[PDB]
């Protein structure tokens, strides 16, 4: 079964655990390109009472650096906020818990904004059919495929 974090049947405990960044997408492509601050490789999600602890690593000159963030529940069910290179809010429009997790994030920095979408997998890659479903979700949010970057061949340290 599939769910959305904003849906009535969402079970947040089921997204706990191992995840990997498979694809990132954005309407400001520079944010997820090689030296972008949002080209983050997720490692795990730790579900707590009213927050999610997110563990990531970044890459620079073939060198991995760890980073943890705490995302807090907001007043809207299924939405979380976190401070990182500006103010971010995100939701999980679609997940099947056991294979994939699709997230939609809004960043706000210096009075501007951009959208980021991420496809995360329980393993270090996902099927091409799930990747296509993600491209369709990106299209529904006005993000062109040329702004979708598959990072499955670069998500391990």
Swiss-Prot record:
Found, by tissue, as follows: Abundant in the urine of adult male mice but absent from that of females.
Question: In this record, what's one Pfam family?
Answer: Lipocalin
Keyword Methyltransferase assigned: no
Recorded GO MF terms:
insulin receptor activity; pheromone binding; small molecule binding
> Highest taxon of the source?
Eukaryota
Q: List the disulfide bonds.
A: 64-157
Q: Which GO terms describe its cellular component?
A: cytosol; extracellular space; nucleus
Keyword annotations for this protein? Disulfide bond, Pheromone-binding, Secreted, Signal, Transport
Keyword Coiled coil listed? no
Q: Name one GO biological process term.
A: mitochondrion organization
Among PROSITE patterns, the record links this protein to:
LIPOCALIN
Tell me the compartments it is located in.
Secreted
Q: Which family does it belong to?
A: Belongs to the calycin superfamily. Lipocalin family.
What PANTHER family does the annotation carry? LIPOCALIN, MAJOR URINARY PROTEIN 1-RELATED
Give the protein's function: Binds pheromones that are released from drying urine of males. These pheromones affect the sexual behavior of females.
The protein's name in its UniProt record: Major urinary protein 2
Supply the source organism for this entry: Mus musculus
């Amino acid at each position: 079964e599939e769910a959305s974090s904003t849906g009535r049947n969402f079970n947040v405990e089921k997204i706990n655990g191992e995840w990997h960044t498979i694809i990132l997408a954005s309407d400001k492509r520079e944010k997820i390109e090689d030296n972008g601050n949002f080209r983050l490789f997720l490692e795990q999600i730790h579900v707590l009472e009213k927050s999610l602890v997110l563990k990531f690593h970044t890459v620079r000159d073939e060198e991995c650096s760890e980073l943890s963030m705490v995302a807090d529940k907001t007043e809207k069910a299924g939405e979380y906020s976190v401070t990182y290179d500006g103010f971010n809010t995100f939701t999980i429009p679609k997940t099947d818990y056991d294979n994939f997790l699709m997230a939609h994030l809004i960043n706000e920095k210096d009075g501007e904004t951009f959208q980021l979408m991420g496809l995360y997998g329980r393993e270090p890659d996902l099927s091409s059919d799930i990747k296509e479903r993600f491209a369709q979700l990106c299209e529904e949010h006005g993000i062109l495929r040329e702004n979708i970057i598959d990072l499955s061949n670069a998500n391990r340290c």
